[PDB]
Design an enzyme around this catalytic site. Sequence first.
Site, PDB file in Angstrom:
ATOM      1  N   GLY A 128      26.016  -1.245  59.144  1.00 28.97           N
ATOM      2  CA  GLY A 128      27.106  -0.667  58.328  1.00 28.97           C
ATOM      3  C   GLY A 128      28.174  -0.043  59.223  1.00 28.97           C
ATOM      4  O   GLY A 128      28.456  -0.573  60.301  1.00 28.97           O
ATOM      5  N   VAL A 147      29.659   3.718  60.939  1.00 29.94           N
ATOM      6  CA  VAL A 147      29.281   5.100  61.239  1.00 29.94           C
ATOM      7  C   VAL A 147      30.490   5.831  61.797  1.00 29.94           C
ATOM      8  O   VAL A 147      31.115   5.330  62.730  1.00 29.94           O
ATOM      9  CB  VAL A 147      28.119   5.174  62.261  1.00 29.94           C
ATOM     10  CG1 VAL A 147      27.830   6.615  62.658  1.00 29.94           C
ATOM     11  CG2 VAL A 147      26.859   4.535  61.694  1.00 29.94           C
ATOM     12  N   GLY A 173      28.465  -2.547  62.496  1.00 34.24           N
ATOM     13  CA  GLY A 173      27.707  -3.740  62.809  1.00 34.24           C
ATOM     14  C   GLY A 173      26.748  -4.022  61.700  1.00 34.24           C
ATOM     15  O   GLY A 173      27.026  -3.674  60.552  1.00 34.24           O
ATOM     16  N   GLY A 174      25.598  -4.611  62.036  1.00 32.37           N
ATOM     17  CA  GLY A 174      24.564  -4.941  61.029  1.00 32.37           C
ATOM     18  C   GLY A 174      24.099  -3.747  60.207  1.00 32.37           C
ATOM     19  O   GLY A 174      23.740  -3.888  59.044  1.00 32.37           O
ATOM     20  N   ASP A 193      12.830  -1.791  65.753  1.00 31.52           N
ATOM     21  CA  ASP A 193      14.048  -2.161  66.480  1.00 31.52           C
ATOM     22  C   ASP A 193      14.299  -1.216  67.659  1.00 31.52           C
ATOM     23  O   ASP A 193      15.440  -0.817  67.950  1.00 31.52           O
ATOM     24  CB  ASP A 193      15.253  -2.215  65.518  1.00 31.52           C
ATOM     25  CG  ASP A 193      16.416  -3.045  66.071  1.00 31.52           C
ATOM     26  OD1 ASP A 193      16.182  -3.941  66.921  1.00 31.52           O
ATOM     27  OD2 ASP A 193      17.572  -2.778  65.662  1.00 31.52           O
ATOM     28  N   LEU A 202      32.841   5.626  64.861  1.00 33.94           N
ATOM     29  CA  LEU A 202      32.058   5.461  66.090  1.00 33.94           C
ATOM     30  C   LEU A 202      31.723   3.983  66.307  1.00 33.94           C
ATOM     31  O   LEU A 202      31.718   3.514  67.434  1.00 33.94           O
ATOM     32  CB  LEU A 202      30.785   6.316  66.059  1.00 33.94           C
ATOM     33  CG  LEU A 202      30.993   7.835  66.078  1.00 33.94           C
ATOM     34  CD1 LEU A 202      29.687   8.598  65.858  1.00 33.94           C
ATOM     35  CD2 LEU A 202      31.647   8.285  67.377  1.00 33.94           C
TER      36      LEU A 202
END
EC number: 2.7.11.1
Length: 270
Positions: A18, A20, A15-16, A132, A12
């Site tokens: 990990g 997915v 990024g930061g 976040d 999917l």
Amino acid sequence: PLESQYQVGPLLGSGGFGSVYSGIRVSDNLPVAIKHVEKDRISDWGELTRVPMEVVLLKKVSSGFSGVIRLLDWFERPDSFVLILERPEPVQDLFDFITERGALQEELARSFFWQVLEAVRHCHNCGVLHRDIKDENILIDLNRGELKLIDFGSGALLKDTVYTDFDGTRVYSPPEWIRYHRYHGRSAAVWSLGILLYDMVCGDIPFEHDEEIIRGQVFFRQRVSSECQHLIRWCLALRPSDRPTFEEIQNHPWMQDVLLPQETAEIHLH
Ligand SMILES: NCCN1CCC(CCN2c3ccncc3Oc3ccc(Cl)cc32)CC1
């Protein structure tokens, strides 16, 4: 056991946080999401057994139903942790939704924003600070019109004293962080909610640079009601103590007569 119990699908994204993957639980074909986090990239550990804080936080909030994507299971590997998460289907994150449709009608923003507020209140009730909150950490269940918070990897245990670390998204980060490297949990969260609401009703974030965040002057490029403008400016008060509490946000005149999720999907998503 991880490899047998789950059938892996497409990546999917990465990024930061990990990497997915889409997945399926073989036991009952439950759609899941499979998240891999490298141990080397974890700066923030907790305990139940050393685990990523994210597992601690998700266990604290995955009891009962809510607008938080639930941790179904986790596994440790030699160099990584693997998290099994709920996956709504069909689904779209709010960043992509806003990118495609542009600025959201106010009725739709109101429904979405209300559900984000309920999810954030539930987290805070459970002793969890997300840290976040932003469009790409919100998933929309397109059939049910239900919003779900994801990615607790920058989060922390909620406390009443000052935070002096922050790993969230800068453009959603409050002026007190920019200037002093300090913030308190709830009021920082309210600032990020003001950024999010502006994003919803304008189709973009209000501030790009540090200097704009610190100046805190909000300009509307899109037609937005006086009332919605007022709530946004209130959430984005420069002084943390001038910001509304969650209660005050939800009692604000703009927040009245929210659509329920299902009618939201009928009117705006089907
Ligand atoms: N502009 C979007 C481009 N991509 C950005 C990355 C995104 C993966 C999202 N994700 C997730 C991301 C980070 N921590 C936990 C997560 O738990 C999920 C549970 C269930 C689903 Cl369906 C998804 C997640 C995929 C899209």
